[PDB]
Amino acid sequence: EKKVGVIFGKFYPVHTGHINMIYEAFSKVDELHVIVCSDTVRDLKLFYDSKMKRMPTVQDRLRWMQQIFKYQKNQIFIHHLVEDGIPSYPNGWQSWSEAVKTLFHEKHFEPSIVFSSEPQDKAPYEKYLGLEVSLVDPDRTFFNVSATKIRTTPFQYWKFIPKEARPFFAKTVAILGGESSGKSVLVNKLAAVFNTTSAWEYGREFVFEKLGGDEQAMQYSDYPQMALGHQRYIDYAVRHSHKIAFIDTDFITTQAFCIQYEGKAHPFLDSMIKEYPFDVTILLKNNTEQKQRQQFQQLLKKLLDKYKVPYIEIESPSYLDRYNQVKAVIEKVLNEEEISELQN
Amino acid sequence: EKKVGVIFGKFYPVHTGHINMIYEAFSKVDELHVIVCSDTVRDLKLFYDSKMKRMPTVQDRLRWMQQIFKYQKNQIFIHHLVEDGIPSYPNGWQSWSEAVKTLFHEKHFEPSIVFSSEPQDKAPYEKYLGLEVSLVDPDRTFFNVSATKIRTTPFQYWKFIPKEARPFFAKTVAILGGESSGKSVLVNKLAAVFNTTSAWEYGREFVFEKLGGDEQAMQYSDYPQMALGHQRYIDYAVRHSHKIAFIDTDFITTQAFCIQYEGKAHPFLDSMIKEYPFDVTILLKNNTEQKQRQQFQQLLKKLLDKYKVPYIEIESPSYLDRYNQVKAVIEKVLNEEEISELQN
Amino acid sequence: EKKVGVIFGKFYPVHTGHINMIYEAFSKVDELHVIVCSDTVRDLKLFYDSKMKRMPTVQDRLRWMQQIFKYQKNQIFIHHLVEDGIPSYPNGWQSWSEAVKTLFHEKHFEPSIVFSSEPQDKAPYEKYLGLEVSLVDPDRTFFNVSATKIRTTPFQYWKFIPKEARPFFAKTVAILGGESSGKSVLVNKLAAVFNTTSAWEYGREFVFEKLGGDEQAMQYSDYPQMALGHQRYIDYAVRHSHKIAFIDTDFITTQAFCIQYEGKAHPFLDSMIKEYPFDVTILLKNNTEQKQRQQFQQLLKKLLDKYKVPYIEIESPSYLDRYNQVKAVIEKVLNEEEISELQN
Amino acid sequence: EKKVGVIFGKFYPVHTGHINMIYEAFSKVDELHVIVCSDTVRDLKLFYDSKMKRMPTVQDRLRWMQQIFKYQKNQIFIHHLVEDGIPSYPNGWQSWSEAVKTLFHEKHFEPSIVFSSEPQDKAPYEKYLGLEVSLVDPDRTFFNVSATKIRTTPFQYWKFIPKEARPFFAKTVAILGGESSGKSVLVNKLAAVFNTTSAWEYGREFVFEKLGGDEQAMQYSDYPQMALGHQRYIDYAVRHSHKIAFIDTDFITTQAFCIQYEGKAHPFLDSMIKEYPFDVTILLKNNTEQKQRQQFQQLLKKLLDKYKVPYIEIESPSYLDRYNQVKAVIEKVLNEEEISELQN
Numbered sequence A, B, C, D: 001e002k003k004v005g006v007i008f009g010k011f012y013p014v015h016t017g018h019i020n021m022i023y024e025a026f027s028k029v030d031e032l033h034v035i036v037c038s039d040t041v042r043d044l045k046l047f048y049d050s051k052m053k054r055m056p057t058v059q060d061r062l063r064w065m066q067q068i069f070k071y072q073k074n075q076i077f078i079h080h081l082v083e084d085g086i087p088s089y090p091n092g093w094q095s096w097s098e099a100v101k102t103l104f105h106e107k108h109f110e111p112s113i114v115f116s117s118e119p120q121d122k123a124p125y126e127k128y129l130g131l132e133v134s135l136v137d138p139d140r141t142f143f144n145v146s147a148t149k150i151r152t153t154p155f156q157y158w159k160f161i162p163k164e165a166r167p168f169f170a171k172t173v174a175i176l177g178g179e180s181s182g183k184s185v186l187v188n189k190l191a192a193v194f195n196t197t198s199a200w201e202y203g204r205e206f207v208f209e210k211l212g213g214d215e216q217a218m219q220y221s222d223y224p225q226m227a228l229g230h231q232r233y234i235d236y237a238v239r240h241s242h243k244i245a246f247i248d249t250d251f252i253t254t255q256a257f258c259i260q261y262e263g264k265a266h267p268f269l270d271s272m273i274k275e276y277p278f279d280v281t282i283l284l285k286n287n288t289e290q291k292q293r294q295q296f297q298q299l300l301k302k303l304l305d306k307y308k309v310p311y312i313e314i315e316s317p318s319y320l321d322r323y324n325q326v327k328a329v330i331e332k333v334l335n336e337e338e339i340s341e342l343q344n
């Protein structure tokens, strides 16, 4: 025999709600085929309509599934269905089931049962696709969540967002400032206090070594690697972030460091800057315990100003203070919003 | 010059409160020495007084620190101080500072400053050890927590327990039952619903292969490895557990499997059984959709009964039901307690 | 359409020769099914006939394949075929192709092409199974190797053995001796000199801490974990061994340590001892630079003697010497053999 | 007391010879300080004098040590000594020992013994630094190797180069060609045959999906990640390369793919191209079993030609052939050299 089932979704994004369902259906079959359906214009409207920074590609999405069901990749399959031109959901099944059928051929599989919620699809599935259907928790008894709720307010529904997607819904807070090191501790204490992650300044060991005598501790061709490692860090922090990820330094800090020590810029750091924007950038100013430091900060603003980097500069007299000021803004990110130079 | 500081603690256990502090002190020094102080009898009373399953050894403790501050192991050091015979805290400093001094010699380091909270120690530190002292968040402004609070009610203070210790405060729930597979899905759905982890049945692929024809899919010398892998799983689940970790099958299930198929027992599975007890063991019985299954369950109870394994057997007519029954008990673990055959 | 191919083998063991082939066939199909065929008695004769320490189970074998082709597990499948009762290779195809057919049904796949070498199978495959066949490097142009060559002399054909199997063909050399620490360095220098791996003594840090004052640095309930970690180490060393893996200490050393400090034994260490034998055990004696050490060595021999642990004791006056003596024996393992108390 | 030793080196590069030594010295001390000494102009001459592609920075070097002795970072330390202006080796000790002394202060450590080979240094060390010295294998009995031998002919001394450095001495061979897929298999078969590694084309799954209908399977903003993953791969391949690492596709192939499908280029791919050159680039042409393929190859040469990418184009009628042609060139890399469009 060999039972075989299908599933359709937009998975924009994928929540523990879908996830659970998919496993459920999977325990009822020997082989399950999971379809990620996209609509260039529809998807596009949902993205812009939301407040998501970057938009998840079809690839980004397929990959989420591809990953979530890796251990079972030998039974659970994942395909992409393109529904462009095909009339809006309520009615188009004739036109839709066409492509579905097409997929089933060029992908060589014939499902005989479909899983879902949205009862309103049973008959139609039965009609145009002619399959046995099976409702599964439509009342949302388990996993009281939706792609729209998460897409609208990520933080209120965080426990429902799989770690594969987190990158499209987490917020990164980068903290620029002088070698004060107060930064790093503050960056760590914050993550601690907010039960979340942080991503150190990659190569901080040499930064401190240079800055000190050693002119060769950090040189022009080092920067690229340094940046790339700082990236490895950030990604772990996001992958595991609770809602926000504190990032010690940012790529601009690295491009700043370079320039100051070589007079040159380095196209690679430039590229990184444009590739990995941050959600919130905070600038720390101090002046109470004289060198070339004031020059770095000068340089940071200049570089920050270019690139059009929205940032909110903090000035403070003592540690404990700075901590509060920052903690304050963050608190507004975890809820409130619209900052830009903050409500001060 | 080269500034150098010390810290004393019992770290029973270690919370994000201590952790934070230690980093703080660390940013004020080039080299920090962290002392884990033990008292055979004192420690012993605290353990038994609590409701912790296993007791953390001196090694277990040193290792927590050893690990938490691994990346900084080149500046932050960790030592063990034995305060047995030395009179109870309030007064004994003369007798205590003796050993401290002894450590500082046989460990070749001379700190010149000490960090802590508990102001009541400044003068004494200044007195008997003669060091500069520095209060740090005594009001517990950040990290409103204590070794006693966590030691008393782990779950209420979970966000304060580092993942290194979790094993001594998390609870494992093992679910025994037939090949029903409903187990596995249920075991996963549970972890999902409770935003926590689960540890699959290692080698489930072959279990299902055997059980089916293939008598060679799982044979006597396989068991040891199988068990050990199931262990790798459990440990990840605990290391990352939210408060509880659902464990598909247990070592007894493996020893049961063996016996049934070889007539023998296997000393190794036996050892594993006695080494890794579980916090809660749940037994699933079914009888509504006839083979040799009833024999396995029979065998499970026999093995469960020996070993003195406290367990609570669940009987149920349909999936959705079983789910509720289980979910019920769990809910009592996350709060209430004392079950043993449950309040039914 | 959807092309689909099969492959048959004993894979006892699996060499880069099979591996290569399988990928080759895989690039010619959309879906490849790889059959591991076993014969209780045949396999059994091949094992005993060889000089392999432990025998690879059907599970051990399926797992090798299961692993080697993990990334492709969604297209390349692996099945077990039982050919017991079925007449010896040359003739039995009628009886053999029966089961093959049976598998193809209860496993729901119908291949239409078979890959192999051994031309002598084309017609028969064409005959009894009726499939298109395709020779692939029968002249062994690439991968001049065989399951028998490796099974006979592993070391001469090491470059052909995948790391998944290495455990069944690598040799472990454990080195027991006093805290001399000369051990560890020697154990490392050896691996270095022989461009191979080594597996440290897990928890050496505390061993040295105990042995010194700290009676609580290593206590009875620590041993189990310590052992298990030492195991994690050994396995990495084997997984990556060049031909041999130097192991600092052995499980008996741990059971010895225990006894000496608790008077008890600990069933768990006992189990480990019986589970993980070593290929060569070397004993280091010294007496030139008085404590309780002579007692440990005494204890090691007593424990070694029981368990029936074949071992070769080395006595030496200075480091450089010991190094040569050891290096000597090893050299005989990489080639010659039969030692037991060595050729001295 | 607390014994403490130093070591000086250029470590250009670091071989298992140095490594071994350093551990040796380490077993004779409680704390060892390892100095990496650089000379802008000297180092620079050694690099150019050799045939190394990229030059190891001071950072690259410190990091090698920093890494090799990570597990022991709490006792073995690593420092950088700048000997610029200080007269050439044979004589300058007065001027050299000055800085050494300076380091010992600003780095707060006072060694009382020095390790090395090169006896000719004992007295001088004794003289200008006044330390107890200790020869260690000067006859190069163990580890018959030198920084110059490796720096001159890496492959002949591969077993002596730690995996941390491999990147500066391994060779990467990238293989460009059409979706033929013959590439990938060939790229893998090569690594197999040469007992070495390979780094697949990251995201090959979608490449093949696009190329086929799916215009959304791989879009403009995907490229950056794709590239970066292909990088993760290459780095593993080098880190573990035997002497050479076969790389499926190269960054130009990715920039080519982009352009062809968006008409644009993407600055990021551009940056990657300039950052990660390859040692040998091979181009595969085919014309025997018509689409838009000929256009890609056209595009590859255009992009290859720009960037000034030295490449050797291979034309061949059948697989087996191509394999030989390639295998041929490689064989010349493992020994001979100077190719550029090859000796054909």
Ligand SMILES: NC(=O)c1ccc[n+]([C@@H]2O[C@H](COP(=O)([O-])OP(=O)(O)OC[C@H]3O[C@@H](n4cnc5c(N)ncnc54)[C@H](O)[C@@H]3O)[C@@H](O)[C@H]2O)c1
Binding pocket: A008, A009, A010, A011, A012, A017, A018, A021, A037, A038, A083, A086, A087, A088, A089, A090, A091, A092, A093, A094, A096, A115, A116, A117, A118, A136, A137, A138, A140, A142, A143, A144, A145, A146, A147
């Ligand atoms: N044009 C047409 O006529 C036509 C007809 C049928 C389908 N379609 C397309 O097929 C796709 C199907 O999309 P969809 O509605 O399934 O997208 P979706 O991502 O919202 O839902 C995926 C599945 O998850 C289930 N689910 C969601 N949240 C759940 C929760 N909290 N608990 C349990 N289950 C939960 C849903 O019932 C659904 O079957 C769409 O692209 C749609 O436009 C089009």
Ligand SMILES: NC(=O)c1ccc[n+]([C@@H]2O[C@H](COP(=O)([O-])OP(=O)(O)OC[C@H]3O[C@@H](n4cnc5c(N)ncnc54)[C@H](O)[C@@H]3O)[C@@H](O)[C@H]2O)c1
Binding pocket: A197, A198, A199, A200, A201, A232, A233, A234, A236, A237, B070, B071
């Ligand atoms: N907060 C950070 O940015 C950061 C970066 C590197 C390492 N670490 C910590 O150092 C310890 C081990 O260091 P090591 O000796 O392996 O040095 P390392 O540089 O080799 O560490 C790499 C390890 O750090 C982990 N890691 C990477 N980015 C991380 C992040 N943002 N947050 C937490 N972990 C991250 C990785 O999973 C990996 O196992 C771990 O506790 C690790 O968490 C933290």
Ligand SMILES: NC(=O)c1ccc[n+]([C@@H]2O[C@H](COP(=O)([O-])OP(=O)(O)OC[C@H]3O[C@@H](n4cnc5c(N)ncnc54)[C@H](O)[C@@H]3O)[C@@H](O)[C@H]2O)c1
Binding pocket: B008, B009, B010, B011, B012, B017, B018, B021, B037, B038, B083, B086, B087, B088, B089, B090, B091, B092, B093, B094, B096, B115, B116, B117, B118, B136, B137, B138, B140, B142, B143, B144, B145, B146, B147
């Ligand atoms: N017998 C004697 O006369 C004598 C005298 C002095 C010390 N001692 C011994 O020294 C050891 C010191 O133990 P301890 O009191 O530090 O143990 P502890 O583990 O409770 O505290 C460790 C440190 O963490 C700080 N801390 C704890 N919770 C915190 C939080 N939430 N936020 C910020 N900081 C926090 C504490 O102030 C303390 O310095 C004990 O073993 C004690 O018996 C004995």
Ligand SMILES: NC(=O)c1ccc[n+]([C@@H]2O[C@H](COP(=O)([O-])OP(=O)(O)OC[C@H]3O[C@@H](n4cnc5c(N)ncnc54)[C@H](O)[C@@H]3O)[C@@H](O)[C@H]2O)c1
Binding pocket: A070, A071, B197, B198, B199, B200, B201, B232, B233, B234, B236, B237
């Ligand atoms: N829930 C489980 O018990 C369990 C066990 C193994 C793998 N997995 C999952 O399978 C996927 C990868 O499988 P694979 O192809 O590497 O097979 P694998 O058996 O090699 O997986 C080992 C991997 O699983 C992770 N892992 C181990 N125990 C785990 C646990 N209890 N919960 C979650 N992760 C655990 C480990 O960190 C490791 O990376 C991951 O998503 C992993 O989480 C889950």
Ligand SMILES: NC(=O)c1ccc[n+]([C@@H]2O[C@H](COP(=O)([O-])OP(=O)(O)OC[C@H]3O[C@@H](n4cnc5c(N)ncnc54)[C@H](O)[C@@H]3O)[C@@H](O)[C@H]2O)c1
Binding pocket: C008, C009, C010, C011, C012, C017, C018, C021, C037, C038, C083, C086, C087, C088, C089, C090, C091, C092, C093, C094, C096, C115, C116, C117, C118, C136, C137, C138, C140, C142, C143, C144, C145, C146, C147
């Ligand atoms: N009783 C019967 O009548 C009968 C009939 C047919 C098959 N069988 C069974 O089918 C199984 C087939 O075993 P097998 O002979 O394939 O075992 P095998 O493990 O030696 O070979 C597996 C495959 O690898 C290929 N191969 C091996 N070394 C190679 C190298 N260096 N380079 C390239 N290719 C290489 C072989 O040609 C073969 O197809 C056996 O169990 C056999 O007894 C039985």
Ligand SMILES: NC(=O)c1ccc[n+]([C@@H]2O[C@H](COP(=O)([O-])OP(=O)(O)OC[C@H]3O[C@@H](n4cnc5c(N)ncnc54)[C@H](O)[C@@H]3O)[C@@H](O)[C@H]2O)c1
Binding pocket: C197, C198, C199, C200, C201, C232, C233, C234, C236, C237, D070, D071
């Ligand atoms: N030779 C050994 O037995 C051994 C054991 C542990 C660590 N190490 C080395 O220490 C360094 C990192 O230490 P850490 O800070 O992560 O401590 P750790 O104890 O956490 O190291 C575990 C790491 O060591 C590796 N490892 C495990 N057994 C190994 C073995 N026999 N040989 C080589 N590597 C092994 C594992 O893959 C893992 O990444 C690495 O260079 C590692 O090779 C060696």
Ligand SMILES: NC(=O)c1ccc[n+]([C@@H]2O[C@H](COP(=O)([O-])OP(=O)(O)OC[C@H]3O[C@@H](n4cnc5c(N)ncnc54)[C@H](O)[C@@H]3O)[C@@H](O)[C@H]2O)c1
Binding pocket: D008, D009, D010, D011, D012, D017, D018, D021, D037, D038, D083, D086, D087, D088, D089, D090, D091, D092, D093, D094, D096, D115, D116, D117, D118, D136, D137, D138, D140, D142, D143, D144, D145, D146, D147
């Ligand atoms: N200008 C001056 O007067 C003066 C005086 C003394 C030292 N120095 C500087 O100090 C540094 C010392 O450099 P170096 O000569 O040690 O560099 P190196 O990298 O070649 O050697 C490092 C160490 O490894 C040992 N070693 C190398 N290969 C070995 C092998 N195969 N087996 C065993 N041991 C091996 C060497 O004996 C040496 O002590 C240089 O920068 C040198 O110029 C300068």
Ligand SMILES: NC(=O)c1ccc[n+]([C@@H]2O[C@H](COP(=O)([O-])OP(=O)(O)OC[C@H]3O[C@@H](n4cnc5c(N)ncnc54)[C@H](O)[C@@H]3O)[C@@H](O)[C@H]2O)c1
Binding pocket: C070, C071, D197, D198, D199, D200, D201, D232, D233, D234, D236, D237
């Ligand atoms: N040859 C390759 O380029 C390449 C790339 C990825 C994975 N793989 C193989 O796939 C298997 C596991 O895949 P997965 O399910 O984790 O997918 P994955 O993409 O998550 O695999 C990442 C894993 O592949 C290893 N890896 C990365 N680059 C590698 C390289 N060039 N050569 C060998 N290993 C490399 C990494 O160490 C890591 O454990 C392993 O056998 C791995 O070797 C190979």
